Design a protein around this ligand. Structure first.
Ligand SMILES: CCCCCCCCCCCCCCCCCC(=O)OC[C@H](COP(=O)([O-])OCC[N+](C)(C)C)OC(=O)CCCCCCCCCCCCCCCCC
Ligand SMILES: CCCCCCCCCCCCCCCCCC(=O)OC[C@H](COP(=O)(O)OCCN)OC(=O)CCCCCCCCCCCCCCCCC
Ligand code: SF4
Ligand code: SF4
Ligand code: SF4
Ligand code: SF4
Ligand code: SF4
Ligand code: FES
Ligand SMILES: [K+]
Ligand SMILES: [Zn+2]
Lengths: 116, 96, 48, 176, 207, 114, 95, 108, 378, 129, 263
């Protein structure tokens, strides 16, 4: 029917969620090695917080196929970090250290510009 | 026809000049403001009006293929000269 | 000019030692050639 | 049709095998290479004495953009924006209005010479030979802002290079 | 003759038409449409399930021997529900002919990797993944090939902005190259060039 | 004729018994085609071309003359293609292309321009 | 060209070839840099009659692709006849 | 002129950025610059390195190498002729000739 | 094993086992500029200069590939003189690329002197480009419909004078490389490709002819006036770097052979299609005729509309089969322009060709593939 | 009759997390799905055939150095073409953009008659021709 | 129930009696070329650019004014129809001035576009062109009347839509001129609309003169607030500046017109 579609890897959320945890464990265990090889100025705890935050923003997904892609992309990101294909600049682009915070309240937006 | 503003900055042929309180004048400190000295509006006024003996004259700017597209100018109106739309040259009809 | 030299070395300019109030005895620049001679010096024409 | 580059069988007769033995032991073919570079030592070098000598160019050479005038001093540009619409690098910015005497002229004509790809399409598209690429190729600057030309810089180039632009156009206008 | 018009080759149009029916008869399970353009180029439009069967037949069959994969690319048409069109350009040195094979997929449906058939598809599929976001199943090594490490988005999608979302810059405070939201000193000037008058009546679509 | 020294193609070795190699391969292709339904187009077309090539092998002893008859380049290139045809026919049995179309496209999938 | 006869012999012998016949430096055998003005020809469509554009319009003779098959006994065929075998060069078959 | 054809980065005095600087290549170029012993100069050659040129509006092009490293001479062209680049090297030599490192030190 | 990240525009991530190469993984994209996405925002004439800058050693052979594709969709035919100019400068360009390929390859493995001898010849061939277009490299001279301008008087005599002496220049290059045992040691039996692997890995050009495959698009699928010239296709026998080096050096000799015939058989006529809805009119008639000015105005603002369709047009560029898959939607801007760079498939096979070789052989293998990263990355 | 094993997925298609778009440009934007109005300067109707999707205009300011128009909006130049209204809404919904759909405006069929220019009694008679 | 059957290139289309050949071709998506016909003005039939071949009929018929008959087959793309369009285009451009680069209509001119699509690609006119004196009809509409192709749209719009019978044709033959004869200003609350209907650069917006080209403007569809009608407009902007205001078709509010204040 219309709702019948090929799976990427997972046939339902339960199988997809397994791959999410397997990815989280791989990421969780590479922050100390990443913070060491790249000689980052951040701590391991805040490096693991960023991993947690990335896994949290897209936590409302219910389509098994979308989850597979998010894990496929997540593994590609992990492979680049482990292989040291990335450099110190690429690892630190998750932290946005150079752009001032954009205020989220209505009044603060109203003073600075026309954007909502 | 370069005029100078009260502060001293040259006015360009487009009429551009920074006001007195404009901070952008700081780019010319230690440097200069490049202003072309030959104002086109003034040089095309110096050209004499051409007296032709027909109602319609054609201008191609001079030089044949090196000029501008050839256009025909109507000279029936005796209260003004017929100006070429591309090059500004003026024409008049002899005693009519 | 020396037309017995091979193409490229058959024309050259010895720059002035003073141009527009600047001492160019040792400091010479390729942009000091005026446009009329620029054409002849770069072989865009045969007529100086 | 085709040919084989490396499909020859070396002779095995005793003379040929000894000719190859002499080449290996006595380095004969390595000594031809020495002869070919000793030849070049006694050839006149191809170097020219820049900046006193210049590399040859042609009237079509595409160099620094410039804005031209009619023989009367009037600008040739009538703010049509065909050059702006064809610039592949979108390096031309034009604004226009009715001049004080009613003429159709630009109030802005900028070329970002760091966006320009020096392709000459603008001078192809101009119906009045206003914007051209002159013969100049020595205008390197020490700051990025000196390469953002406005209408004054381009008009100054035209007055500065008209004597040479006009003769280059006269030499090549019959091919275009 | 007519000096300014491209001469037709009706012999090559006939031959490619016959071979198109040949392929449509031998693989009815996948072939969905066969067409020959006015300049004699054969296109076989297939179901995505037939990527390996159809390509293998064209590579190995004695009357096809399409042993070169000239190119493999994708085209993004957002108006279709299967927005991506996967295109295979094959060459046959035996019969001195070319054939084009087309299929389709969407942002989520995998396509089968044709690496087992043509080894040349290894990098072409990575470029399709990198630039369009089409996932190829059973690819030996699938990852970005052209985009910067950690690049977000797929640039060749029709909805991806031309200048992207981030630009790089060296920050002296942190002593490294950083990425920030893109701000252009001069915005790209969008020209609307289309003429309001129909150019080619032969391609008019029904009302 | 005297056996050639090389086929000219790197990695393609010279075959010393081309006729016997082609008879086996062609006869083996026909045997595999017997497992395909009679109405399948792949059966009808592959048997037709295979028989023509097999007829030429049995009808011409000279290798150079056989190569011109078959129009497949060096005889070693004909043998390699017969090996590719044989591996293709085996795989078609698993694919079963002769079946009806798996699915239809959406209404305007192959419409150009949009 | 300004080299003396002696150095000419030395360069020639070391190379093994007569270099003075083919010098890599261009002397006065190249075209003059000021040429006479041209007068280029016109194309086949420069006519005053019998030149309607509907009879020489290539773009409007393009047609949409022919649909040989769609989803909305006989002899087997190949895309084209087998490629004819190449012939060895008569100019220099073996380098 | 004394300008060797190609020196190793650790023996080099001037860096010629000749071509398009993409985002993927930007950190590599900065690292080579940071490892150049001083005095060090940068020559931006062509429109791509000057301001992005033909690819100014691309998602993967640094809009001018002068966002990554400081630039001493900009050479316009696409490409600048070999003579135009040479005119830019001779302008860098004239720029070194105008330095006053010891005068500034003396008057400090 | 030892992992070396040979950073830079090529980044090789090799896995060495002693002195042998166990795995070569080219990391590319250091010159990816989004050319294909930019072309979608340009008219067809505006997208032409983008093709000079893909294989920037064979500039006027890239333009011809694009022009043949747009002409195929336009259903027009460039005039006969324009096709002889396009075949004359196609072979001058092939000399430019093969000088850059052989000599840079030689310079990489130590031989630095032939680079300077032949780059004087390149300097004289850059003058032919500058006398027809005004640019030394990125001419933008070959266009859909023909060429921009006609050859200036005196050029063909200058091409003849250059072509007389060029065989002697190749003979001097061969006195340094062909028989030199050190050069043969660096190239013979290095990077061997079997004819079947070469076809399946998408190779083209001398990457096939070096392995004995008899294929050349100039003879099997001729374009322009290549069917009216006589030349030979050099074929290798071992599939190695040395045979590929001999194919390239022999192709330069055949290019001089073709240039000799273009100069003699150059016909008269116009140099762009006499159809002012595709090719702009002469400036002389753009300034006198109303129709001409209208067509000049619209060809330089909107451009010519191309009928809807899709073509894969390919040529035998010096690097190999260069083609474009060009999709038209009926408007004046391309819908899709996929570029098939021959080096993209070649460099993908570097890993296979490097198996069982030492680290210093990887430099010779990359040279024999004739890789330019303008076309690999696009 | 596909051999490939399919699965059931009953949820609205949504790809916002796998497109790489910053969250600021998915939630704050306002798509507009419309058929472009005819350019009133011309009578051609060949630009009113397809549906377009464009986004809400944002700030453009004057560049201090040259007076050029600057922008910080990555979607300012983005325009998409769709065959029908439905397949344009479908694209917006899966990308997460809020949208406004404007119904196509087709010219009303007119009753035209040349003879009415010379009417005996009615007011349609023309004074000049 | 009264629909008759007519064919357009063989395709059957049912049309109410009184439908013209042009209208019947618009029911199959074909737009016949036109200069003098405007669907909101009275039919004129004097540009002859709409001539189309009726199958079996020796003479081409003005599609804008010819009521279609039962069973007619309208050959909109035959050799006879295409040769009729090139002849008429050749006559329109014979005296037209080489003004495109200085003409505000360039890039959105129906004479340009239809010349590219239906006219020839070169000229055989070897004579001198006609030049025409200019008329000052107020501060809102600039008139360069050498660009006029004598289509009479302005005359009909003023007479029928605006109710001002001040425009007309004085003279005869090739010297026929459109204007007011006397020195008079066409000052009407709907006067600015003659700029739009005029297919050429003869009538242009004087405030807008020379400021922009059509291809570089961004078009925003919004509403007018100068009055309570709610006229639909398009606001043309370039580089963040407002350049001009154009009408937008709404059949129930303003058709395709706007007032001078709105414009
Ligand atoms: C042939 C033989 C070759 C071998 C011998 C080589 C001898 C070459 C002459 C050496 C002359 C001394 C030059 C020393 C470098 C000067 C310099 O770089 O100035 C920058 C420096 C820096 O000036 P600064 O203090 O203003 O720098 C401040 C700015 N920052 C913070 C960025 C550094 O100037 C000096 O410090 C001058 C040093 C003292 C004066 C040296 C004179 C000694 C002469 C006898 C030796
Ligand atoms: C030595 C001179 C010589 O051999 O005369 C040539 C003679 C004729 O042989 P030919 O017809 O040329 O072809 C080879 C047939 N056997 O050759 C012969 O027939 C003799 C037999 C040929 C084989 C001789 C092999 C001897 C090679 C041993 C190495 C000799 C060098 C040793 C010294 C090394 C230091 C220089
Ligand atoms: S030469 Fe090319 S890039 Fe430079 S301004 Fe002219 S059109 Fe633009
Ligand atoms: S320079 Fe030429 S093309 Fe550009 S706006 Fe001026 S007249 Fe038009
Ligand atoms: S030649 Fe032009 S396009 Fe190529 S790198 Fe240099 S500036 Fe960029
Ligand atoms: S009205 Fe049209 S054709 Fe006439 S000059 Fe103006 S733009 Fe050109
Ligand atoms: S001025 Fe314009 S609307 Fe009036 S008759 Fe002339 S072309 Fe037609
Ligand atoms: S539109 Fe019919 S004659 Fe003018
Ligand atoms: K108008
Ligand atoms: Zn004039």
């Amino acid at each position: 029917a219309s709702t019948s579609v090929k799976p990427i890897f997972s046939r339902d959320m339960n199988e997809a969620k397994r791959r999410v945890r397997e990815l989280y464990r791989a990421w969780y265990r590479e922050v100390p090695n990443t913070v060491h090889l790249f000689q980052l100025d951040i701590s391991v705890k805040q490096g693991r917080d960023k991993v947690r935050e990335m896994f949290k923003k897209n936590a409302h997904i219910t389509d098994p196929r979308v989850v597979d892609l998010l894990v496929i992309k997540g593994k590609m990101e992990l492979e680049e970090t482990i292989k040291v294909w990335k450099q110190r600049t690429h690892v630190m682009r998750f932290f946005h250290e150079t752009e001032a915070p954009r205020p989220k309240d209505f009044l603060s937006k109203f003073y600075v510009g026309h954007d909502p | 026809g370069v005029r100078t503003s009260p502060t001293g900055e040259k006015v360009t042929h487009t009429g551009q000049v920074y006001d007195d309180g404009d901070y952008r004048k700081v780019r010319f400190v230690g440097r200069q403001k490049e202003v072309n000295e030959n104002f086109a509006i003034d040089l095309i006024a110096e050209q004499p009006v051409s007296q032709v003996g027909s109602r319609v004259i054609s201008c191609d700017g001079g030089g044949g293929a090196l000029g501008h597209p050839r256009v025909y100018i109507n000279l029936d109106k005796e209260t003004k000269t017929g100006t070429c739309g591309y090059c500004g040259l003026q024409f008049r009809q002899q005693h009519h | 000019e020396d037309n017995k030299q091979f193409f490229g070395r058959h024309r050259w300019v010895i720059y002035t030692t003073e141009m527009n109030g600047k001492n160019t005895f040792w400091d010479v620049d390729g942009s000091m050639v005026p446009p009329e001679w620029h054409r002849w010096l770069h072989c865009m024409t045969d007529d100086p | 049709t085709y040919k084989y580059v490396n499909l020859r069988e070396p002779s095995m007769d005793m003379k040929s095998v000894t000719d190859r033995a002499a080449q290996t032991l006595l380095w004969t073919e390595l000594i031809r290479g020495l002869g070919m570079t000793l030849s070049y030592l006694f050839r006149e070098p191809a170097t020219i004495n820049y900046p006193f000598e210049k590399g040859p160019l042609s009237p079509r050479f595409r160099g620094e953009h410039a804005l031209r005038r009619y023989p009367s001093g009037e600008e040739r540009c009538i703010a049509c924006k065909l050059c702006e619409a064809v610039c592949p690098a979108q390096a031309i910015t034009i604004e226009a209005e009715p001049r004080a005497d009613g003429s159709r002229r630009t109030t802005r004509y900028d070329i970002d010479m760091t966006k320009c790809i020096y392709c000459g399409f603008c001078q192809e598209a101009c119906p009045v030979d206003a914007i051209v690429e002159g013969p100049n190729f020595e205008f390197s600057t020490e700051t990025h802002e000196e390469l953002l030309y406005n209408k004054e810089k381009l008009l100054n180039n035209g007055d500065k290079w008209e004597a040479e632009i006009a003769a280059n156009i006269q030499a090549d206008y019959l091919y275009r | 003759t007519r000096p300014t018009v491209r001469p037709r080759n009706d012999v090559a149009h006939k031959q490619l038409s016959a071979f198109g029916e040949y392929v449509a008869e031998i693989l009815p399970k996948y072939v969905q449409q066969v067409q020959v353009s006015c300049f004699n180029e054969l296109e076989i439009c297939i179901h995505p399930d037939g990527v390996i069967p159809v390509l293998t037949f064209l590579r190995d069959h004695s009357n096809a021997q399409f042993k070169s994969l000239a190119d493999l690319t994708a085209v993004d048409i957002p108006t279709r529900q299967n927005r991506f069109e996967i295109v295979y350009n094959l060459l046959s040195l035996r019969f001195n002919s070319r054939i084009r094979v087309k299929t389709y997929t969407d942002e989520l449906t995998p396509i089968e990797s044709s690496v087992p058939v043509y080894k040349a598809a290894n990098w072409y599929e990575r470029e399709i993944w990198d630039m369009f976001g089409v996932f190829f199943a059973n690819h030996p090594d699938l990852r970005r090939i052209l985009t910067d490490y950690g690049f977000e988005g797929h640039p060749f999608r029709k909805d991806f902005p031309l200048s992207g979302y981030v630009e790089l810059r060296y920050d002296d405070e942190v002593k490294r190259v950083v990425a920030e939201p893109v701000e252009l000193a001069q915005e790209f000037r969008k020209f609307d060039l289309n003429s309001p008058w129909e150019a080619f009546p032969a391609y008019r679509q029904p009302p | 004729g005297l056996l050639k020294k090389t086929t000219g193609l790197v990695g393609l070795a010279v075959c010393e018994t081309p006729h016997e190699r082609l008879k086996i391969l062609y006869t083996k292709i026909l045997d595999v085609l017997g497992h395909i339904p009679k109405n399948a187009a792949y059966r009808k077309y592959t048997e037709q071309i295979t028989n023509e090539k097999l007829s030429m092998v049995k009808a011409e002893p000279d290798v150079k003359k056989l190569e011109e008859r078959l129009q497949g380049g060096q005889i070693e290139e004909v043998i390699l293609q017969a090996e590719n045809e044989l591996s293709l026919a085996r795989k078609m049995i698993q694919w079963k292309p002769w079946e009806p179309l798996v699915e239809e496209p959406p209404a305007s999938q192959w419409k150009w321009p949009i | 060209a300004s080299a003396t006869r002696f150095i000419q012999w030395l360069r020639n012998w070391a190379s093994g070839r007569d270099l003075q016949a083919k010098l890599q430096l261009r002397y006065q055998e190249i075209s003059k840099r000021t040429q006479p003005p041209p007068k280029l020809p016109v194309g086949p469509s420069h006519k005053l009659s019998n030149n309607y554009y509907c009879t020489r319009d290539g773009r409007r003779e393009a047609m949409p692709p022919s649909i040989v098959m769609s989803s909305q006994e006989k002899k087997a065929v190949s895309p084209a006849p087998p490629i004819k075998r190449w012939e060895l060069s008569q100019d220099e078959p073996y380098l | 002129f004394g300008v060797v054809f190609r020196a190793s980065p650790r023996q080099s005095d001037v860096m010629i950025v000749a071509g398009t600087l993409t985002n993927k290549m930007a950190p590599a170029l900065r690292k080579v610059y940071d490892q150049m012993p001083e005095p060090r100069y940068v020559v931006s050659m062509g429109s791509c390195a000057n301001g992005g040129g033909y690819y100014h509006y691309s998602y993967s092009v640094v809009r001018g190498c002068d966002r990554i490293v400081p630039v001493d001479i900009y050479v316009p062209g696409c490409p600048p002729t070999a003579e135009a680049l040479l005119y830019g090297i001779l302008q860098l030599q004239k720029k070194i000739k105008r330095e006053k490192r010891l005068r500034i030190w003396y008057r400090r | 094993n030892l992992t070396l990240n040979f950073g830079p525009v090529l980044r090789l991530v090799m896995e060495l086992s002693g002195e042998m190469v166990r795995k070569c993984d080219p990391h590319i994209g250091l010159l990816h500029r989004g050319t294909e996405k930019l072309i979608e925002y340009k008219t067809y004439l505006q997208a032409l200069p983008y093709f000079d800058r893909l294989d920037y050693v064979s500039m006027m052979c890239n333009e011809q590939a694009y022009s043949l594709a747009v002409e195929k969709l336009l259903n027009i035919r460039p005039p006969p003189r324009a096709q002889w100019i396009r075949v004359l400068f196609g072979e001058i360009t092939r000399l430019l690329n093969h000088i850059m390929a052989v000599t840079t390859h030689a310079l990489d493995i130590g031989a630095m002197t032939p680079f300077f001898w032949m780059f004087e010849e390149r300097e004289k061939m850059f003058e032919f480009y500058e006398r027809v277009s005004g640019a030394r490299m990125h001419a933008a001279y070959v266009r859909p419909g023909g060429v921009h301008q006609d050859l200036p008087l005196g050029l063909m005599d200058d091409i003849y004078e250059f072509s007389k002496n060029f065989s002697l220049r190749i003979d001097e290059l061969e006195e340094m490389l062909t028989n030199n045992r050190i050069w043969r040691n660096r190239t013979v039996d290095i990077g061997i490709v079997t004819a079947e692997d070469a076809l399946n890995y998408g190779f083209s050009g001398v990457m096939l002819r070096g392995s004995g495959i008899q294929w050349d698009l100039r003879k099997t699928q001729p374009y322009d006036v290549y069917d009216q010239v006589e030349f030979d296709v050099p074929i290798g026998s071992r599939g190695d770097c040395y045979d590929r080096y001999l194919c390239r050096v022999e192709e330069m000799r055949q290019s001089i052979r073709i240039i000799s015939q273009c100069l003699n058989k150059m016909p008269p006529g116009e140099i762009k299609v006499d159809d002012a809805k595709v090719s702009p009119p002469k400036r002389a008639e753009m300034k006198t005729s109303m129709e001409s000015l209208i067509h000049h105005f619209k060809l330089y603002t909107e451009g010519y509309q191309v009928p809807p369709g899709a073509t894969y047009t390919a040529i035998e560029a010096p690097k190999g089969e260069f083609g474009v898959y060009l999709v038209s939607d009926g408007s004046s801007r391309p819908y899709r322009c996929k570029i098939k760079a021959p080096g993209f498939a070649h460099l993908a096979g570097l890993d296979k060709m490097s198996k069982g070789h030492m680290l210093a052989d990887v430099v010779a293998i990359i040279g024999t593939q004739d890789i330019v990263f303008g076309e690999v990355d696009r | 009759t596909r051999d490939t094993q399919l699965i059931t997925v009953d949820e609205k298609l949504d790809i916002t997390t796998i497109t790489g778009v910053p969250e600021e440009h998915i939630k704050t934007r306002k798509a507009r799905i419309f058929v472009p109005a005819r350019n009133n300067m011309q009578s051609g109707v060949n630009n009113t055939k397809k549906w377009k999707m464009e986004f809400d205009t944002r700030e453009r300011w004057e560049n201090p150095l040259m007076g050029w128009a600057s922008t910080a909006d990555p979607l300012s130049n983005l325009v998409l073409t769709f065959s029908t209204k439905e397949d344009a809404v479908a694209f917006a919904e899966k990308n997460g953009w809020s949208y406004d759909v404007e119904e196509r405006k087709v010219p009303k069929p007119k009753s035209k008659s040349y003879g009415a220019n010379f009417s005996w009694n009615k007011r349609t008679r023309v004074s000049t021709k | 129930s009264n629909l008759i059957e007519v064919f357009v290139d063989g395709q059957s289309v049912m049309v109410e009696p009184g439908t013209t050949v042009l209208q019947a071709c618009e029911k199959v998506g074909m737009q016949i070329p036109r200069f003098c016909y405007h669907e909101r003005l009275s039919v004129a039939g004097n540009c002859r650019m709409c001539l189309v071949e009726i199958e079996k009929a020796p003479k081409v018929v003005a599609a804008c004014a010819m009521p279609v008959m039962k069973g007619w087959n309208i050959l909109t793309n035959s050799e006879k129809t295409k040769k009729a369009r090139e002849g008429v285009m050749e006559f329109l451009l014979a005296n037209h001035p080489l003004d495109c680069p200085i003409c505000d209509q360039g890039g959105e001119c129906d004479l340009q576009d239809q010349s590219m699509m239906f006219g020839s690609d070169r000229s055989r006119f070897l004579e001198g062109k006609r030049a025409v004196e200019d008329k000052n009809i107020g501060p809102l509409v600039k008139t360069i009347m050498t660009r006029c192709i004598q289509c009479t749209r302005c005359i009909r719009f003023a007479s029928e839509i605006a109710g001002v019978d001040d425009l007309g044709t004085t003279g005869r033959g090739n010297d026929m001129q459109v204007g007011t004869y006397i020195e008079k200003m066409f000052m009407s609350e709907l006067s600015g609309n003659i700029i739009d209907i005029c297919p050429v650069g003869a009538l242009t917006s004087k405030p807008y003169a020379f400021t922009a080209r059509p291809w570089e403007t961004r078009k925003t569809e919004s509403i007018d607030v100068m009055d309570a009608v709610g006229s639909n407009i398009v606001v043309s902007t370039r580089t963040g500046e407002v350049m001009r205001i154009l009408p937008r078709m709404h059949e129930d509010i303003n058709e395709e017109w706007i007032s001078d204040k709105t414009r």
